[PDB]
Amino acid sequence: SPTELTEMRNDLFNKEKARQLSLTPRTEKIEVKHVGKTDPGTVFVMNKNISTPYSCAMHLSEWYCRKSILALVDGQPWDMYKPLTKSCEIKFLTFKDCDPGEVNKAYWRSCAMMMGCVIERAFKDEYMVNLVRAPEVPVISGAFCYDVVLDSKLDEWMPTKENLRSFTKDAHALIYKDLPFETLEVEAKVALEIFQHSKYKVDFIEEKASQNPERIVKLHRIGDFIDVSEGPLIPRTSICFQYEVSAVHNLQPTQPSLIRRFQGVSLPVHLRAHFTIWDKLLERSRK
Amino acid sequence: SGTWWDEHLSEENVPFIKQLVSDEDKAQLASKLCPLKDEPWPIHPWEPGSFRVGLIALKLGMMPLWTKDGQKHVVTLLQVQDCHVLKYTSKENCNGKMATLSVGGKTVSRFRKATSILEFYRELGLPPKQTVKIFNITDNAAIKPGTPLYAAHFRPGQYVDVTAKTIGKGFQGVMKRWGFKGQPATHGQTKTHRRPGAVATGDIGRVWPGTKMPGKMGNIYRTEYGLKVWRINTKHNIIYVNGSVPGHKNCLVKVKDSKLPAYKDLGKNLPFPTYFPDGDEEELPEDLYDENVCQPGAPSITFA
Amino acid sequence: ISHGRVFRRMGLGPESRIHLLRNLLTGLVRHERIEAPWARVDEMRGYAEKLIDYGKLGDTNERAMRMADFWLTEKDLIPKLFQVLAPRYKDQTGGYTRMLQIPNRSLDRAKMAVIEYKGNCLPPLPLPRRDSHLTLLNQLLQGLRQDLRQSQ
Amino acid sequence: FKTEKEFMQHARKAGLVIPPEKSDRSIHLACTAGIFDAYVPPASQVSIRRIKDYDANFKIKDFPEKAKDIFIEAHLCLNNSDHDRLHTLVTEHCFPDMTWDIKYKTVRWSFVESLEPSHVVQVRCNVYGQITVRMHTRQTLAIYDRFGRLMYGQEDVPKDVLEYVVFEKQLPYGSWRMHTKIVPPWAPPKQPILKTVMIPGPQLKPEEEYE
Amino acid sequence: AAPKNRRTIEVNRCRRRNPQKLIKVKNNIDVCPECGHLKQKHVLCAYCYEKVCKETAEIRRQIGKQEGGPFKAPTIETVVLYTGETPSEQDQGKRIIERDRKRPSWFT
Amino acid sequence: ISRKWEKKNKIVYPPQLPGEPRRPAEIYHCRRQIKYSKDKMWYLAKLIRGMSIDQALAQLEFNDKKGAKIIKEVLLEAQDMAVRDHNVEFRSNLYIAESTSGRGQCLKRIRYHGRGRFGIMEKVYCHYFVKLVEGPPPPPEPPKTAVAHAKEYIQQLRSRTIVHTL
Amino acid sequence: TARGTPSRFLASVLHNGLGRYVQQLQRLSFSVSRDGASSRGAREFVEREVIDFARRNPGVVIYVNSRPCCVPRVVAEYLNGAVREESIHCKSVEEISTLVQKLADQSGLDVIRIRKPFHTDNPSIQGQWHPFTNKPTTFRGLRPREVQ
RNA sequence: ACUGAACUCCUCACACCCAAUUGGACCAAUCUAUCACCCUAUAGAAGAACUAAUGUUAGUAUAAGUAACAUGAAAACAUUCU
Ligand SMILES: [Mg+2]
Ligand SMILES: [Mg+2]
Ligand SMILES: [Mg+2]
Ligand SMILES: [Mg+2]
Ligand SMILES: [Mg+2]
Ligand SMILES: [Mg+2]
Ligand SMILES: [Mg+2]
Ligand SMILES: [Mg+2]
Ligand SMILES: [Mg+2]
Ligand SMILES: [Mg+2]
Ligand SMILES: [Mg+2]
Ligand SMILES: [Mg+2]
Ligand SMILES: [Mg+2]
Ligand SMILES: [Mg+2]
Ligand SMILES: [Mg+2]
Ligand SMILES: [Mg+2]
Ligand SMILES: [Zn+2]
């Protein structure tokens, strides 16, 4: 059952948090220098595997909590709610930076994962929804993609407008829930413990674990929903302000099964658009 | 934090969004130029008792006009700028005495309207209008919403009511607002030159409602009644209305046929739903004149 | 009722307001950047751009010499107006000054403002930048433009 | 102000002339500004007789017992904020150094059995006796807040403490009291603290830049 | 004219606590990206403009030293140069204001 | 003179149990004899009564009134003594729970009027009181809907009794 | 008045009359000065009448304290935790017998206003009035201007 | 016929609705005498009781944050200009 999948997968996620926190050396304290343009050179003498970059923001100001979205922890993009590991240097990255490449990418991945979180809880109990992946789609393409495999019953099905409107209502309902993103860097073996009932994600974790010199695989969680991704994510679901599931396409080389690709587009609370500009960005995001 | 459309755009995108949204505005306006090549609502003939649509125009300014008796008649110019029919409600869903057409004028930026309003014009297929005015109208005159309304809807010889908001004069005192006489300058008269005198009497221990006092003169809807159309300019969509129209220049006026009891059966020769240039029958000249109007280009008139 | 009245009444008369704008305009031809209250700043902006437009009539035009003799209360600034400011701006036809707002004056909380002349040696003001082109929305609209170039 | 010299120079600039007046009563201090000779951890029997000629009944073979009972009892008075006992148990150079920062917070220090026989280390010497004692004990701390929430150390877990406690005695009515506590630079750091700390950088004036 | 009675604190509280007399929460407020001091929209950052004011102050002091007395406004354009900088090929025929500190990160 | 507000940062609570939620800190700071009036301080004090301290600092850096700078001095000083003296780990994690303003000890001066008559000016002083509380600010009270009004009206209809009988 | 004072409904403690009657007064506490004219009639109450009172109802336990008080009191404590302290300062022996018998007779309810002079808990026996008593039904349950 | 009072009846309790005036029973607090001893008693005395004198003195309101008040301009705060 999908409810059973939430219970068993979330319980394995909590076993990974339990076997992740209990190896701490009783609150070791590492310092991290705020290397940035503004407020320069303030060390945060913080906890080892407890504190997040959001805690550094909570030491600085509410402005750096609300506005800052990723953290360059030594030149690499890091989640704002990811636990730190060692002594390092933190930049904070917002949408309105001069070169916000990784923030756009993390917003892109986060919106795709929220989309799949809507899709897997969209259908009635007799239709098997089976999510494969999100491809790394550039922002200039106009729409984040999320490839979805459905059952053979819906092989000759195409959603109406009001089906997609119900998907947007479920996604805005998921924005209103204000859910943070739990993150866990896990080895490959427990990731295969979690996603053992979906062959596409088994092969996907087999892609991600072999890419690294370790068998390290990122895992994420919104609420009751665990998904794999490629990079960092947004701190919360509350940041996505405008959200629309625009269209559904079907891939052309479908001999075994329809890898049915879903299209979405979204803008944050910071980069709002006007109603007419947003309608034109809906006219572009259906390809 | 309240935003606006120019806020998060770079210098690359601002002329792109300006020219692009303006181009969809001109394309959506030019898509309505074939109302009869669409499926309109059926055209009924005129009947004694029927009412038709008005217009919404701009007050361009005034200019003199001379009749063949050699008399100045001062004339306001009213340009009809992108007037359209926006929604029809019958007398059932209006619960009034008569049906109603919401008709709008003067296309306005899509970035300064409410989202419900932009959903209304997004459904309708037009750029949003500045003013919506509502015309009481019978079932015989009912054009499809979205049809353009032109200046030849009115013809010369027709008498016309024109309503608008008058020029606002703000908090004006008693003499400028109600024309009271005030007090003499000299012979004492310490601090009274422009004041109201008494207000009520001593036995009435209060002031009656509707008492003339200082207050905000102007900026309210008034209507001028019975104003003859001397000339319409078809190429620029101008009405040449007799006399004076309420309101400042470049204000939007609501131009309907006159309700006067001496001018209530002269719609026999007017185009009754509206004028359709799509109908192509006997295309109108550059400018339509009344019988009295001394045209420019006519020789200098002689009274013999 | 002041519809179309376009001049701020200032000072203690029309004469004293034109002496206020003459002193502010003299101070900006001299120092090339001024903090002043905002109404005096945009009134004097209107006079300042026309003052350059008389600067472009040439050193030899006696009308413009009477005008620059009037408006510049210090006399050393008149060779600056005909040999520095007017050759600086001979490329463009308008938009000579720029205006920004200061935070308000700490004395009386007045709406303050800076006008400078564009293109000078002074440290440039923290000008309000647009959001940079690589932000999320600007890349979505860049994608929309890259589609609507591919429609020809 | 920040020092005596700023108050004296503002006494000269303000014109407030303070004449130095002589009073017959001076301050009868009972302490020292620190340690006479700072013991450095990894022959002074003349000072022992310089204690026995003022005290006349003094046994060092019984002293690190009493040094324990002066130590622990003083820290028991931190559990109850019994300052009236502390001024009998601790010196005045030590009393702000152990009771000031513990104000408005409940400590629940508790001793449990020692690990070594505590022992005397060195002795030095109007006349101020001074005995440094090595202790290696097992203590438990729990320092709370005004709001009674833990901010340093669990109450249950015992920790092993190195202690170089320096005693001083006034040599007609004084007794042995804790004077200082030598912390050596080779010592390991203390417990880590439960919360995180932001440490600000240089607050920049607008003309200044960060380098 | 004199008040006939004394207004009470319940009437007075209804007067001086309505939202027309209360201060509006304003939402113009941002963070300046260059300094991190919170600025306002449509208004320059006071910290960054204080930088610019103090540097224009020292520059105008050295202008006032290099001119000497009133009524010495040049017919020549001006170039501010800092320590360790050659006057440009474009700066030929312009007067030069040598400074003592370095080129700022924000002067260009 | 009473000075009971300085004392309120001295109330020490007994240490908690394992089975007890974490108590939010409370930080009482005030300034005395501010030369400003007590009901021009009410508007600035009222402005910030539920906002977080970073939002309140944002609202008081940009207000034109004289008291805004003084309240920003009080809030910065209470944020510093919040971190140092009172064991509040995050600077940003503070909201203004109470911001009031009493009157201070004023003075009386003579104001000369147009004849031998005169008046008695007061040189008006005030105080400014603040309780900061550790934590996120409480949410603003949502306006009650037609569901809440309908349930309240029907609950009143269910409440009523036959009156002046058994 | 009645709008400034609270009010209550007429009740008893644990249905005080139904099965058996229970004396609601637990303790009396006399405090009577040995030497003092204030507690003279209290002393004459202890010498004469508090023993016969203590025997006329044995469910009351009585504590005469006999301390140097300056105003004598009696403290009646009731079964429901109510404590009514009344002064016997300069009152004669008969007035203390009526006062103590008054405290014995009543209960530990408040002496605030009682709203109704009665308390049924089953007020209606034939069924309470609703607007469809005294209205006849019609055939097929039809309402006015209903055809079918 | 009903309604309808402070009249009258009814259950219990009764000295318990007039101005000026007059008769009487008590009595707050204070001091004194003597008791008393978490605030009293019997007497004796007296600067012996304030919702009101355009009362006096002090405090703080209301009117009211109102009427009124105050700094020529730029700048290097050297200076210059009006
Ligand atoms: Mg006069
Ligand atoms: Mg007079
Ligand atoms: Mg003025
Ligand atoms: Mg006063
Ligand atoms: Mg009756
Ligand atoms: Mg009677
Ligand atoms: Mg009676
Ligand atoms: Mg007496
Ligand atoms: Mg008296
Ligand atoms: Mg009184
Ligand atoms: Mg009276
Ligand atoms: Mg009085
Ligand atoms: Mg007031
Ligand atoms: Mg004012
Ligand atoms: Mg008033
Ligand atoms: Mg005034
Ligand atoms: Zn800034």
How are beta strands D128-140 and D119-124 bridged, if at all? antiparallel
Query: Residue A51 has what DSSP assignment?
Result: -
Taking contacts as CB-CB distances below 8 angstroms, the residues of chain F near G123 are 166
Q: How far apart are CA A132 and CA A207, in angstroms?
A: 13
Residue B268 identity (one-letter amino acid): K
DSSP string, chain G: --SSS-EE----SS-TTTS-----EEEEEEE--SS-GGGHHHHHHHHHTHHHHHHH-TT-EEEE-----SS-EEEEEETTS-EEEEE-TT--HHHHHHHHHHHHHS-SS--SEES-S---SS--SS----TTTT----GGGPPTT---
Q: By C-alpha distance, which of A233, A253, A254, A242 is closest to A281? A: A242
CB contact under 8 A, C141 and B11: no
How are beta strands E78-81 and E95-98 bridged, if at all? parallel
Q: How far apart are CA G101 and CA G88, in angstroms?
A: 13
Q: Estimate to the nearest angstrom the gap between the alpha carbon of B14 and the chain centroid.
A: 34
Query: Residue F2 has what DSSP assignment?
Result: -
Are D134 and D121 a contacting pair, CB within 8 Å? Answer: yes
Residues near B78 by Cβ (< 8 Å), separated by ≥ 6?
B55, B57, B58, B59, B60, B162, B238, B239, B241, B245, B253, B255
| Alpha-carbon distances of D190 from C12, C112, D183, D187, F111, rounded to whole Å | 74, 56, 11, 9, 66
φ and ψ of C116, to 5 deg: -120, 165
Q: By C-alpha distance, which of B285, B298, B179 is closest to B231? A: B285
Q: How far apart are CA B261 and CA B264, in angstroms?
A: 6
| Alpha-carbon distances of D6 from B70, C1, D18, F83, rounded to whole Å | 100, 65, 14, 30
Query: Residue F28 has what DSSP assignment?
Result: E
Q: How far apart are CA F152 and CA F155, in angstroms?
A: 5
DSSP string, B15-80: HHHHHHHHHHHHHHHHTTS-SSSS--PPPPPP-TT-----EEEEEEEEEEEEBTT--EEEEEEEE-
DSSP string, C67-134: HHHHH-SSSTHHHHIIIIIHHHTSS-SS--EEEEPPSPPTTT---EEEEEESS-SSPPP---PPPPTT
Element at A241 (helix H, strand E): strand A240-250
The answer to whether position C98 is within a domain reads yes
CA of G92 to C1' of H15 (A): 22
Scan residues 109-148 of chain C and list those with Cβ within 7 Å of strand H.
none
Are A244 and A168 a contacting pair, CB within 8 Å? Answer: yes
Residue with tokens 């026989």: D117
Are E56 and C33 a contacting pair, CB within 8 Å? Answer: yes
- Joined together, the tokens standing for residue E107 give 């002067």
- Which residues lie across from G77 on neighbouring strands? G27, G83
Three-class SS of residue D205? coil
- Sheet of F126-134: strand order equals F26-34, F126-134, F94-100
| Lookup: nucleotide whose C1' is closest to E7 CA | H62
Could you state, in order of their start, the residue ranges of all structural domains in chain D?
A: 4-182
Query: Residue E64 has what DSSP assignment?
Result: H
- Per DSSP (E only), the strands in A122-170 are 130-133, 144-149
- Which residues lie across from B164 on neighbouring strands? B222
The answer to whether position C76 is within a domain reads yes
| Torsion sign over Cα A170, A171, A175, A181 | positive
How are beta strands B252-257 and B55-66 bridged, if at all? antiparallel
The number of helices, as runs of H, and strands, as runs of E, in chain D is 5, 6
C136-149 helix and A101-120 helix, angle to the nearest 10 degrees:
90
Torsion, Cα D47 D48 D54 D60, to 10 degrees, reads: 150
Q: How far apart are CA C149 and CA C147, in angstroms?
A: 5
- Per DSSP (E only), the strands in A34-128 are 43-47, 70-73, 77-79, 88-93
**Phi/psi-derived region of residue B37, left when phi > 0, alpha when psi is between -120 and 50, beta in every other case:** alpha
- Sheet of G61-64: strand order equals G61-64, G25-31, G73-78, G83-87
Are G25 and G103 a contacting pair, CB within 8 Å? Answer: yes
Taking contacts as CB-CB distances below 8 angstroms, the residues of chain E near F53 are none
Q: How far apart are CA F88 and CA F65, in angstroms?
A: 30
Element at C42 (helix H, strand E): helix C38-55
How are beta strands A226-227 and B55-66 bridged, if at all? unpaired
Could you state, in order of their start, the residue ranges of all structural domains in chain F?
A: 1-166
CB contact under 8 A, F12 and D104: yes
CATH number of the domain at C97, please: 3.90.1030.10
Are B288 and B234 a contacting pair, CB within 8 Å? Answer: yes
Q: How far apart are CA E90 and CA F80, in angstroms?
A: 53
Q: By C-alpha distance, which of A108, A70, A131 is closest to A264? A: A108
CB contact under 8 A, A61 and F93: no
| Lookup: nucleotide whose C1' is closest to G89 CA | H40
Chains A and G touch (3+ CB pairs under 8 A): no
- Which residues lie across from G73 on neighbouring strands? G31, G87
Element at F155 (helix H, strand E): helix F146-159
Q: How far apart are CA A170 and CA A222, in angstroms?
A: 14
Are B276 and B35 a contacting pair, CB within 8 Å? Answer: yes
Residues near B299 by Cβ (< 8 Å), separated by ≥ 6?
none
Three-class SS of residue C3? coil
CATH number of the domain at G51, please: 3.40.30.10
Resolution number, Å? 3.1
The answer to whether position C142 is within a domain reads no
Burial class (CB in 10 A: 0-12, 13-18, 19+), D113: exposed
Q: How far apart are CA A78 and CA A92, in angstroms?
A: 9
- Per DSSP (E only), the strands in A121-203 are 130-133, 144-149, 182-187
- Joined together, the tokens standing for residue E18 give 């309505």
Q: Tell me, in angstroms, the distance from the centre of ligand 5 to residue A72's CA.
A: 92
- Joined together, the tokens standing for residue B131 give 């003013």
Residue F113 identity (one-letter amino acid): H
How are beta strands A226-227 and A216-221 bridged, if at all? antiparallel
Neighbours of A282 (CB within 10 A): 16
Q: Tell me, in angstroms, the distance from the centre of ligand 5 to residue E83's CA.
A: 111
Rg (CA), chain D: 22
| Alpha-carbon distances of B233 from B152, B230, B266, rounded to whole Å | 8, 10, 21
Residues near F67 by Cβ (< 8 Å), separated by ≥ 6?
F34, F36, F40, F41, F44, F128
Are D162 and D136 a contacting pair, CB within 8 Å? Answer: yes
Q: How far apart are CA B120 and CA B125, in angstroms?
A: 9
Three-class SS of residue B137? strand
What are the contacts of B41-45 at 24+ separation with CB within 8 A? B41/B142, B41/B143, B41/B144, B43/B273, B44/B140, B44/B141, B44/B272, B44/B273, B45/B140, B45/B272
- Provide the H-helix boundaries in D44-176: 45-55, 63-80, 83-89, 95-99
| Alpha-carbon distances of B286 from B65, B160, B237, F150, rounded to whole Å | 17, 22, 10, 65
Query: Residue B108 has what DSSP assignment?
Result: -
Torsion, Cα A10 A16 A22 A24, to 10 degrees, reads: -120
Are D178 and D66 a contacting pair, CB within 8 Å? Answer: no
Q: Tell me, in angstroms, the distance from the centre of ligand 14 to residue F48's CA.
A: 22
- Joined together, the tokens standing for residue A268 give 């944050």
| Alpha-carbon distances of F145 from A81, B27, D44, F149, G79, rounded to whole Å | 36, 44, 87, 6, 47
Are D193 and A48 a contacting pair, CB within 8 Å? Answer: no
CB contact under 8 A, F90 and A63: no
Greatest CA span in chain B, whole angstroms? 78
Q: By C-alpha distance, which of C49, C38, C7 is closest to C111? A: C38
Q: How far apart are CA B109 and CA A248, in angstroms?
A: 32
- Joined together, the tokens standing for residue C81 give 């107006």
**Residue B61 half-sphere exposure toward CB, CA atoms < 13 A:** 2
Are B161 and B223 a contacting pair, CB within 8 Å? Answer: yes
Are C103 and C55 a contacting pair, CB within 8 Å? Answer: no
Q: Estimate to the nearest angstrom the gap between the alpha carbon of B125 and the chain centroid.
A: 23
Residue with tokens 């072999």: A210
Residues near B76 by Cβ (< 8 Å), separated by ≥ 6?
B59, B60, B61, B62, B240, B241, B243, B244, B245
How are beta strands G25-31 and G61-64 bridged, if at all? parallel
Residue A12 identity (one-letter amino acid): L
| Alpha-carbon distances of B37 from B40, B142, D144, E72, rounded to whole Å | 8, 17, 85, 78
Residue with tokens 């204690």: D51
G37 contact to strand H (CB, 7 A limit): yes
G92 contact to strand H (CB, 7 A limit): no
Taking contacts as CB-CB distances below 8 angstroms, the residues of chain D near F11 are 146
Taking contacts as CB-CB distances below 8 angstroms, the residues of chain A near D200 are 42
Residue with tokens 């000016």: F121
Residue B166 identity (one-letter amino acid): T
What's the domain count of chain C? 1
Q: How far apart are CA F60 and CA A283, in angstroms?
A: 44
Q: How far apart are CA F94 and CA A31, in angstroms?
A: 24
What's the domain count of chain G? 1
**Residue B303 half-sphere exposure toward CB, CA atoms < 13 A:** 4
Query: Residue D61 has what DSSP assignment?
Result: G
CB contact under 8 A, B9 and C130: yes
Which ligand is the nearest neighbour of the Cα of F38? 13
CB contact under 8 A, F92 and A65: yes
Give the nearest chain A residue to F90 (CA atoms): A59
Fold adopted by F1-166: Ribosomal Protein L22; Chain A (3.90.470)
Residue with tokens 């003279």: G40
Supply angle C-alpha A126, A127, A132, rounded to 5.
145
How are beta strands A70-73 and A77-79 bridged, if at all? antiparallel
Torsion, Cα D65 D66 D72 D77, to 10 degrees, reads: 170
Q: Which chains touch A (3 or more CB pairs under 8 A)?
A: B, C, D, E, F
Three-class SS of residue E107? coil
Element at A246 (helix H, strand E): strand A240-250
DSSP string, C45-68: HHHHHHHHHHHTT-SS-HHHHHHH
Taking contacts as CB-CB distances below 8 angstroms, the residues of chain F near A62 are 52, 54-55, 92
Q: By C-alpha distance, which of E99, A34, A97, A37 is closest to D210? A: A37
Q: By C-alpha distance, which of D41, D35, D161, D26 is closest to D91? A: D35
Are D138 and D158 a contacting pair, CB within 8 Å? Answer: yes
| Protein-contacted bases of chain H (C-beta within 7 A) | 35-42, 59-63, 65, 71-82
Supply angle C-alpha A104, A107, A110, rounded to 5.
150
Known binding-site positions of E for Zn(2+): 32, 35, 45, 48
